[PDB]
Amino acid sequence: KLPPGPRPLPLLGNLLQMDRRGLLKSFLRFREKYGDVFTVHLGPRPVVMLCGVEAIREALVDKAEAFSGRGKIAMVDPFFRGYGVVFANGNRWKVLRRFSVTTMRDFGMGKRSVEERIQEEAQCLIEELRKSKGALMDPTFLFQSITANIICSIVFGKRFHYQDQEFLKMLNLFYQTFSLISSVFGQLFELFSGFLKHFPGAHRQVYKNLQEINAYIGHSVEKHRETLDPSAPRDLIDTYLLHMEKEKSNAHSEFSHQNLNLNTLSLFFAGTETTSTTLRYGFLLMLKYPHVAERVYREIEQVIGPHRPPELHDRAKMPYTEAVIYEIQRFSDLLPMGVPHIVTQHTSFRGYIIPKDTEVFLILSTALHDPHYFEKPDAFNPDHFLDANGALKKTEAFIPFSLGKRICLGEGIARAELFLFFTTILQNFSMASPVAPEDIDLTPQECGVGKIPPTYQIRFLPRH
Ligand code: HEM
Ligand SMILES: OC[C@H]1O[C@H](O[C@H]2[C@H](O)[C@@H](O)[C@H](OCCCCCC3CCCCC3)O[C@@H]2CO)[C@H](O)[C@@H](O)[C@@H]1O
Ligand SMILES: CC1(C)[C@@H]2CC=C(CBr)[C@H]1C2
């Protein structure tokens, strides 16, 4: 039998037992009653929730033969339709995961490492903040520009300038789209898309925004193909175009133009909106807890100094700064319910039977807030990741990128981005804002698929 859960009504599923504050709060109320493994009916679909690091790990690691499927996010399914690595399943996922892992890591002889691309971008960012004259800003656009530019360097062999209005228009579409998908309407759509799709709504705007970004991608593909040198691929798009040409006699080849456009858009969305949202939370946390920002700056002065650019080899020597970044990720809890999975075959789990095709949510938020691993888990406290001697204390509960076959494929890049960009900004700038620390409100602006911080203003003041 499926795991236990609240009794549903036909058509409405468990609607009348949900919490108006959203899906995550609804599921944490059900966890109170049912424990770590339970079923909730989201409209017409039974979805099994797994909570706590033990259960999520038993599923994604111990039973990866069954739990490695990708489930559906209703607000974006109409667009992606199972194309791209994020939303693919089956053999398509195998091929696209392998291609994407290889091309996001290996760039050719004579090409910059991920590290150098981040270090270059971080110097562009510092120059922009110096030219910002200490003015107030919402730093969103810059955190999206630096993260998007790392991916653009890999995918398109170039970066965009921070002043490029056409680049900013695309970043505005990523930002609005992640907010829409995470809205109360987007969560209602997860329950009732069958019915709601026939009316006007945010799902239509999400579709329009994604198509607008994808239009750029399609045109870039067309240009790349026009100038492609098979002997010298310039970037990930050329590499995929050479696979496409190799397999062109197979009508079923997975190297198709829809996979190319949507894999590429998936890489940008996942690599831009994630890390820039974490940076957004990270700097709002530094405004609320300036003594943490001061102690990081102390550590940068002591290990790096005021001038030499941070490098990844510095991390080992900077346990307090790394604890801070771990704690920003833990606290931010970017994807509280992770990204939906589905089971790929009939599975037994803890005495229950989960039929092939059942959707499963791994509630990552419950690991990141497990009070056995993090004392007082609702408070921001970098000591969560430090032992008594101030050495870094890593923990198996720290799973913000998930686990198993679908584990975030950008994990290495994201962690390098968080560390180089956080340290290079704090090396050169301190932070201030009009709101006193006591008054800063960390309550997210949206909390659905994504947890998104409230807008805020910040100044970066040059040091010395
Ligand atoms: C702080 C930054 C990030 C966080 C917290 C994060 C988190 C996650 C999570 C929780 C998943 C779902 C894994 C699952 O299905 O169980 C995921 C998937 C994914 N992420 Fe990340 N992500 C981050 C940054 C990035 C970056 C920088 C990239 C691109 C370089 C990226 C690319 C992807 C891709 C392509 C997938 C789909 C993997 C698949 O289905 O095989 N992520 N991410
Ligand atoms: O290609 C079809 C569309 O072409 C024209 O659009 C342009 C606009 O001319 C043109 O200014 C523009 O430039 C965007 C440049 C920055 C791209 C930033 C990338 C960041 C990473 C993810 C992909 C986007 O791209 C759009 C699509 O190529 C039109 O303006 C739209 O009408 C039209 O539908
Ligand atoms: C927003 C995310 C956390 C990242 C990019 C796209 C997603 C689905 Br629209 C998930 C994976």
UniProtKB/Swiss-Prot annotation:
Gene3D superfamilies per the UniProt record, alphabetical: Cytochrome P450
Cofactor: heme
PROSITE patterns documented for this protein: CYTOCHROME_P450 (PS00086)
Enzyme class: oxidoreductase
Subcellular location: Endoplasmic reticulum membrane; Microsome membrane
Changes after translation: Phosphorylation is accompanied by a decrease in enzyme activity.
Keyword presence, Metal-binding: yes
Tissue note: Expressed in liver, lung and heart right ventricle.
Reactions listed under catalytic activity: N-(5Z,8Z,11Z,14Z-eicosatetraenoyl)-ethanolamine + reduced [NADPH--hemoprotein reductase] + O2 = N-(14,15-epoxy-5Z,8Z,11Z-eicosatrienoyl)-ethanolamine + oxidized [NADPH--hemoprotein reductase] + H2O + H(+); N-(5Z,8Z,11Z,14Z-eicosatetraenoyl)-ethanolamine + reduced [NADPH--hemoprotein reductase] + O2 = N-(11,12-epoxy-5Z,8Z,14Z-eicosatrienoyl)-ethanolamine + oxidized [NADPH--hemoprotein reductase] + H2O + H(+); N-(5Z,8Z,11Z,14Z-eicosatetraenoyl)-ethanolamine + reduced [NADPH--hemoprotein reductase] + O2 = N-(8,9-epoxy-5Z,11Z,14Z-eicosatrienoyl)-ethanolamine + oxidized [NADPH--hemoprotein reductase] + H2O + H(+); testosterone + reduced [NADPH--hemoprotein reductase] + O2 = 16alpha,17beta-dihydroxyandrost-4-en-3-one + oxidized [NADPH--hemoprotein reductase] + H2O + H(+)
EC number assigned by the record: 1.14.13.-
GO cellular component terms listed in the entry, alphabetical order: cytoplasm; endoplasmic reticulum membrane; intracellular membrane-bounded organelle
Residues that bear Phosphoserine: S100
Pfam families given in the database record: p450 (PF00067)
Function comment: A cytochrome P450 monooxygenase involved in the metabolism of endocannabinoids and steroids. Mechanistically, uses molecular oxygen inserting one oxygen atom into a substrate, and reducing the second into a water molecule, with two electrons provided by NADPH via cytochrome P450 reductase (NADPH--hemoprotein reductase). Catalyzes the epoxidation of double bonds of arachidonoylethanolamide (anandamide) to 8,9-, 11,12-, and 14,15-epoxyeicosatrienoic acid ethanolamides (EpETrE-EAs), potentially modulating endocannabinoid system signaling.
Protein name (Swiss-Prot/TrEMBL): Cytochrome P450 2B6
